[PDB]
DNA sequence: TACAAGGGA
């Protein structure tokens, strides 16, 4: 089961995924160059953004958070318990189990049947060479193009400076000689209307990549190395991992910032066979593009279920209107 | 050199133009080697007569007599192409500077000099041709091309030979 | 004079022990007409220092020695006066031929 | 079936087809020199680009993915199911079929009979010498010239640093004592309007290159080593392989980057008989050249069909408007 | 008919006609030395080029491709159907027809009557010693002199290295002992504005070299060994072979490179008689040279028809403003 | 005028070891400076990292970096205005970029 | 020299001692694309003048130098002849280069 | 490197 979600969301007072200035009182958000038509030829502009690697890490965090409560949650790595995404790193032979057992770095089938995190998000074992591509692909989050055009520049990244109070046992602040660390560090914050185009394929859950189909008697029999109940639990957990994505658990500095989050609109397409990925909501004319993509792909012979959040998406297209992202994930899991 | 039915025979004559004595002529006599029936298949670079004489002069160490006396070489070839014997090469260049460059080329050592030339001749025939052209006409790029062709296939190209080549460049 | 060290550094990019085979840089620097292209070629050749040092450290053999800054300025201070390309050619080919020496680095 | 595809697509914040970084923590994106006319005289500029080899690999991946569902999908290499692009490397005599059967490499007719991937994308076995040229031609992806003109380069790239967190059971970063891997790598991301072109010579599928024709009674006729159903099935498999490239499945680092990848404009031509290759979309003045080519080629009497997307193409040429790429491939598959 | 074509064709990111040797890796492209002015003493520069042998082979391929569809396509060599250029190699004294018939290489008349490829492109039979000069000649693809002078030699080449992803069935990248083709290799891609010149001599097709005339009624009647319809079909196929010529089918590595073409300007002359060759487009002042050539050849008393694309020429003489190379060949075939 | 050595020494701090800061981006951007404006911008990004390096050198027990003097900046400015030829601009660009990679003994 | 003074004032913002680091204003000055953007950039650069002016005497080192009226009016006059960003970028980077120089502010 | 063409007793 492969599902694509793409839409526009509103961010305010966010300091998510900064470069990191270093150690002198300055932290600044990551910025990337994007191209816009701006009715004067294509031009390049710097805008704040959050990388898709961090979004994938947060999806891993959500999946491991929602997978512990499952009865089959013991088949997991303890490294995922502390929300660490190291997987196997460099120069590692045995991966310890959350139950305390150990798993060899070879026999990919054993790895995927014992560790669900590596089964879903992939892994890498340079010592032997076992590999597995991620089943969830994350895209960059960028401010939408029409917002950039209609904001006429006017850089909206604001630098808020604030101090780290260090009061000594005598109630005074001195210098480095007396052992006092008084500093005033600055953090950047941004606002705007961003877009997301998360895509995730769940048809290879529990299926080793080195042997997807068995061909017992020249029939397409999937090579499942785990129990069907465990596979269903894993796919349901991976699907419900989207709950914190569109609620406000994306970004760093959540303890001190917790960005003002709201979902403006989105469109989701779900199916079983391979389907074209939806166009990102960054562009102005993405709703019509997705409408055409759905309309002609349905006529081509693909069984696709379409869900929309307050988007008309044209007419004569069978789509379900969902009032929330959690409603959409409930609709996605009811058909599993 | 045989190469099946046909046969290439390269014949050289060494000629003075100014003055010679007995000792010089016996030094020239030492160059002659009896029964040069090389045949074989791996030693196929005996075609391209200039390469064949370079190979012959590689293993000849009679004397470096002509570094003080002027001498010339007259060469010709004989062919057995389908039992059709004729002479198809009569170019007349000299012999002094080639062996002079070889002799200034081999001061540093022989263990990495003779095998160097042999490997470049056997493996990089095009590289050997570039090297011999560079020796004949003193062009800088020839040495670089020969060294690159040698290194590409199997030649070690030690440091001392590089230093000797640089000293030859001056 | 300050040619052996740059020769070793350039040969570090050609030896089989370094399975990277950067022949484009040496071919470009060998075929140089005037100052700008040879300077760009030598810059590109010396830009590959971090990967060479990391590969040498991971292999176990001693890391390559980058040419010292003391003779780095020597290249410049000798090269501006070479207005004629002809006398520039001898050094442009000397560096290339020194780049192809054995230079046993990792035993 | 001879098909030519050309057009322009906008990519934002993509790291597709990097250079791997060699043996350095820095990771470089591939650069190449391109020629720009300009009003001051011809110049050469370094721009990011995508090699055609990886595009061909993704096309093969899409082809095998769409061919698995086909009932004739058993005639596939075992390596194809794992997306292993290598085909009959040095030192191997036989091939392993998808069902586990062994296929000899001494006959090209059998090879194309029971190996669809070798039939479409060609193959080469250096030992036995059997050979077949690929039926798919992919061109390099370069930014369009006028984009380089007004954008005047700006280096079109940004560098983003990502950390590698290695937290042990005790929660320590470690420093050269516990074998930690809490390092810091970086990636390069580019953007701009690029051009693409693809050639599909789907006229030799199931036909050995040695004996294209039979000449039973001096009457030319195709020499097909398989039933026409299998040839047709491979035809629509190749046609539908275009879908998971124009949807966003082009390039590497999909799990972390997933390029935004909007399709701007395109022009397609299709014919039964041989046709000249369509002009690539890199050049600014390519619409008029393609229009003239199509008009004067149709004047020659060639039975060709032209599809346009976001291209006027004039009025003299009879072309059918298309709204999406899958609509285009549907139109292609209607006329077998 | 006698036709001469000369012009300039743009090109970028092309790995065409490389040496491909020099050990095992680093496929490095072919180059040639050319003499230029550079406002000083004549200087020789080292630039990428394409050998005319490749152009001749591709012209043969195009001629075969456009000649199979003709009703006279049976009169063709068996090797031609395979695009094999080994025209009467060592040892053999007979050739195989397309339908399986055999022909003895004894007299030129029978060879040119029954075999079409050996007619247009000539042939050599060492055993019988038969000779026939090819009727098509091509020059090298050299970059134009003014472009070389203006770019001041940035080496006009780039090196792109890429690997094979040959992996074992177990999913691990084995070492050399295990057996794995995971290896790196590099390719050289060139760019720039190139000039070309190709000359055809279709006035002698179907005429044996030994006896061009027969002199029955005391006039030099050409010795046409085949029917006039077959000769016309051969001429039109040879002309139409130029349609895929200037479209992207003159280079190697088409499966991974597919060089990007756009013919910027050219001139063609046709006078069905002995005509001097035009000036190659490599020289920067070839426009005026060709203009003088055509105008004073017309004034001399020869009937030359001139077709021009994107050149002002002299605007005082009858020249057809052709807009495409295939439009040009349509004009050529409409006057046969 | 000797300021080339100083600016190259400063740029060498962006690639060298014992620093954990490897910004090949700015060094390559300065190296490939086709025009003067992007060269000046690359120099600006190179200088923008001065506080981090000058703090961390003392933080890691290393001598302070040789930050270019204002006279060097004035020389760089003047030379960029009387040099409008791309030919000399390219050679000067590679001249100050070449010093970045060397065997500098920043930390004894 | 009518530009060294404003550069010195900008360098006064970020330097050794002087515990008020404002990199945002310097970047805005350097990154500015339109001449007005340069205007607000220099405006926020100047608005911190009283800060340093009264804080310099808090530690005893000599007070900094505030740009004179003639130079700032001359910059204002140079503003309205740059019709293209091509010279605007070079002007902005020239102004912002002196910020990170080795200035002896107050020993 | 394929073919021819040659020098003599």
Automatic annotation (TrEMBL), chains A, D, E:
<dbReference type="InterPro" id="IPR010154">
    <property type="entry name" value="CRISPR-assoc_Cas7/Cst2/DevR"/>
</dbReference>
<dbReference type="InterPro" id="IPR052681">
    <property type="entry name" value="CRISPR-Cas7/Cst2/DevR"/>
</dbReference>
<protein>
    <recommendedName>
        <fullName>Type I-A CRISPR-associated protein Cas7/Csa2</fullName>
    </recommendedName>
</protein>
<dbReference type="Pfam" id="PF01905">
    <property type="entry name" value="DevR"/>
</dbReference>
<dbReference type="GO" id="GO:0051607">
    <property type="term" value="P:defense response to virus"/>
</dbReference>
<dbReference type="InterPro" id="IPR002764">
    <property type="entry name" value="Cas7/Cst2/DevR_sub_I-a/Apern"/>
</dbReference>
<comment type="function">
    <text>CRISPR (clustered regularly interspaced short palindromic repeat) is an adaptive immune system that provides protection against mobile genetic elements (viruses, transposable elements and conjugative plasmids). CRISPR clusters contain spacers, sequences complementary to antecedent mobile elements, and target invading nucleic acids. CRISPR clusters are transcribed and processed into CRISPR RNA (crRNA).</text>
</comment>
<keyword id="KW-0051">Antiviral defense</keyword>
TrEMBL record, chain B:
<protein>
    <recommendedName>
        <fullName>Type I-A CRISPR-associated protein Cas8a2/Csa4</fullName>
    </recommendedName>
</protein>
Automatic annotation (TrEMBL), chains C, G:
<feature type="disulfide bond">
    <location>
        <begin position="61"/>
        <end position="106"/>
    </location>
</feature>
<protein>
    <submittedName>
        <fullName>Uncharacterized protein</fullName>
    </submittedName>
</protein>
